[PDB]
Amino acid sequence: KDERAREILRGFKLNWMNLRDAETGKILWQGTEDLSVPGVEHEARVPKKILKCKAVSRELNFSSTEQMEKFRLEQKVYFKGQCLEEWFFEFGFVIPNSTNTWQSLIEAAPESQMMPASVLTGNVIIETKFFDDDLLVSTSRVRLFYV
């Protein structure tokens, strides 16, 4: 089970990922680091004007040698160690040895609830748990700078 988790994780690869303003269509951010790798605090700089988008299209392209019955993510957004938000995304079935693109639309809260960049930058950690159904495959973390 920890053995399976490890073969799933050993077989997995976040190839690329984009964040795009869903109104203008422009890409605001893209990385190709396997920000999915556990045991390390990754970092990411995003342009602070991302906070002004009404919605952001996140596009993730991933490979998996192993099949997954129900690939999904749970992402907690921590601010100075305090959980502000909890997001759940489901891809579903993953064919063995595939490469897949997963798109998700993340909609902004009303403006009066958006957090300012100056308060967020450097203080936000996104903690992502990678599951196949109920098997926790890994947990990765990213610290965000809004530059």
Binding site: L19, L84, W87, I106, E107, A108, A109, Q113, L120
Partner: peptide, 5 residues
């Protein structure tokens, strides 16, 4: 609705 994206 996200407050941080």
């Amino acid at each position: 609705k996200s407050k941080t994206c």
